[PDB]
UniProtKB/Swiss-Prot annotation:
A zinc finger (UBR-type) spans 7-79. Ubiquitin ligase protein which is a component of the N-end rule pathway. Recognizes and binds to proteins bearing specific N-terminal residues that are destabilizing according to the N-end rule, leading to their ubiquitination and subsequent degradation. Recognizes both type-1 and type-2 N-degrons, containing positively charged amino acids (Arg, Lys and His) and bulky and hydrophobic amino acids, respectively. Zn(2+) 1 binds at H4, C37, C63, C75. Zn(2+) 2 binds at C9, C34, C37, C61. Interacts with UBC2. Interacts with RPN2, RPT1 and RPT6 from the 26S proteasome. It comes from Saccharomyces cerevisiae (strain ATCC 204508 / S288c). This is E3 ubiquitin-protein ligase UBR1. Zn(2+) 3 binds at C22, C25, H43, H46.
C-alpha cells in the first residue's frame, strides 16, 4: 500500500510519472504530490498543475511533510 500514516510519503518519481502541484497549497513551486497521494477533494477550484516527470525534474512526493504545505492535506491512499 501507498499509505504512510504519521510520516512523509517520500515516494521517488520515475520518468514518465504524473506529478501534482498546487499554487495555493504548495509552499513553493518545488512542493509536489504523487498520484497515490493527490486527493482532488483537497483542491476544488484550486490552481492544480499536473505535469509528466522527465529526466531533469527528478524528486520525491511531499505528502505528509507539513512544511511543504499551507493547508492540511488528506492523503488519497489513506481513504
Ligand atoms: Zn506520495
Ligand atoms: Zn500521501
Ligand atoms: Zn490545493
Amino acid at each position: 500500500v501507498h499509505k504512510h500514516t504519521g510520516r512523509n510519503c517520500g515516494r521517488k518519481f520515475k520518468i514518465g510519472e504524473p506529478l501534482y502541484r498546487c499554487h495555493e497549497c504548495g509552499c513553493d513551486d518545488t512542493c509536489v504530490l504523487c498520484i497515490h497521494c493527490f486527493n482532488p477533494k483537497d483542491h476544488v477550484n484550486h490552481h492544480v498543475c499536473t505535469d509528466i516527470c522527465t529526466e531533469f525534474t527528478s524528486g520525491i512526493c511531499d505528502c505528509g511533510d507539513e512544511e511543504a504545505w499551507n493547508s492540511p492535506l488528506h492523503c488519497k491512499a489513506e481513504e
